Design a protein around this ligand. Structure first.
Ligand code: FES
Ligand code: FES
Lengths: 54, 54
């Protein structure tokens, strides 16, 4: 399981789904690209990289 | 691994961390409670409940 924040965009959750973090998606909790229109800014970040066996 | 959206609040990721989804945390990507001050609204939702062995 990998979770990262995309720069100026959604969370990517890979087990891929994209979760809104700007607050303005028309289809919460899934990102629909509204982040770009509202001018959301936040840097990329690694958040979790979990192997269940470790 | 469990990921859920909290009503009017953050994503909860349990392997617990809380990820901002309103866009306005002072400590992105982590929730700091700003969602309540800005009046963010979104319902609760189950998103993933993954067992690596299944
Ligand atoms: S982060 Fe993409 S619509 Fe909100
Ligand atoms: S969801 Fe809590 S500060 Fe944004």
């Amino acid at each position: 399981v990998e979770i990262r924040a995309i720069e100026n965009g959604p969370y990517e959750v890979k087990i891929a789904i994209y979760l809104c973090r700007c607050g303005h998606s028309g289809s919460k909790p899934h990102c629909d690209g509204t982040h770009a229109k509202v001018g959301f800014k936040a840097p990329g970040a690694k958040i979790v990289h979990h192997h269940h066996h470790h």
